[PDB]
Design a protein around this ligand. Structure first.
Ligand SMILES: OC[C@H]1O[C@@H](O[C@H]2[C@H](O)[C@@H](O)[C@H](O[C@@H]3[C@@H](O)[C@@H](O)O[C@H](CO)[C@H]3O)O[C@@H]2CO)[C@H](O)[C@@H](O)[C@@H]1O
Ligand SMILES: [Ca+2]
Length: 251
């Protein structure tokens, strides 16, 4: 599957030490919603070494129970939310990773249309100003906080010719998501978007010109805490890691 996408256009093998490469990765830190993130999430996102770092051939994003204030808004958790400094239309995205094991964590590998104009993102209004869900988004991987034995792939968009919000996708079983690397991938072209866990198709959505999936998207990597899909966080939560061996994008 996906062999047609064979020209490497972007990658990070994470073989260096220190901050995620600033030529490749942009941090979001400004909350988009009056001092909070969306989905009733409980974290702030920071660009500190507490919450992301590269060492030993892998990127780690680390969520921590920690009081933290940004511009008058205090939250009880910190994490990181990275965006690629690379926007693309169509391709094969491969991310090899180990997921957080702890309850309450909501990791994600996903995309937004580069016309999102999301607050504090890297692209602003360069491509347009299509507020989510009109910019489109593809989940390559999410896990909720209460079931670490399944993964989620899910699309969110509004049709170009309607305000009608669409949200659909699938799930698949996973074994040892936290202790064993798996490859989470997307194959995206003018015909279809296919999300895989290793070689299992999680979901395929037919593409068309009436979707926002024919213009550039950028990649996001994050751990949210709590909220819709994070759920209740144990009182004893300390910290947890989302470990990414590499990101590769082919066209
Ligand atoms: O609620 C109104 C605001 O929506 C913002 O877009 C958010 C949206 O609210 C939120 O539900 C969505 O959450 C993502 C899921 O759809 C999915 O793709 O997985 C992501 C990773 O787990 C998850 O964060 O995110 C949208 C983008 O941040 C609008 O941006 C905002 O203008 C509007 O007021
Ligand atoms: Ca690596």
């Amino acid at each position: 599957h996906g062999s047609a996408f064979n020209t490497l256009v972007f990658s990070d093998e994470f073989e260096y030490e220190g901050k995620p490469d600033p030529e490749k990765w942009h941090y979001q830190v400004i909350p988009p919603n009056n001092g909070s993130w969306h989905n009733n999430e409980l974290q702030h996102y920071t660009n500190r070494s507490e919450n992301s770092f590269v060492s030993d051939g892998t990127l780690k994003i680390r969520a921590i129970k920690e009081k933290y204030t940004f511009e008058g808004s205090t939250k009880d958790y910190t994490s990181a939310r990275l965006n690629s400094k690379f926007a693309f239309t169509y391709g094969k995205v491969e991310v090899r990773a180990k997921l957080p094991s702890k309850k309450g964590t909501w990791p994600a590998i996903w995309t937004l249309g580069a016309n999102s104009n999301e607050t504090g993102n890297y692209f602003g209004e360069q491509y347009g100003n299509a507020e989510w869900p009109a910019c489109g988004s593809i989940d390559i991987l999410e896990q909720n906080g209460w079931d670490k034995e399944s993964t989620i792939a899910h699309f969110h968009w509004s049709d170009l010719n309607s305000d009608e919000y669409q949200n659909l996708g699938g799930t698949t079983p996973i074994t040892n998501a936290s202790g064993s690397f798996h490859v989470y991938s997307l194959e995206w072209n003018a015909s279809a978007m296919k999300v895989f866990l290793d070689d299992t198709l999680v979901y395929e959505l037919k593409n068309s010109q009436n979707t926002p999936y024919n213009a550039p998207h950028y990649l996001l990597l994050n751990i949210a805490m709590g909220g819709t899909l994070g759920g209740d966080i144990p009182e004893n939560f300390t910290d947890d890691i989302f470990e990414i061996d590499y990101v590769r994008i082919y066209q």
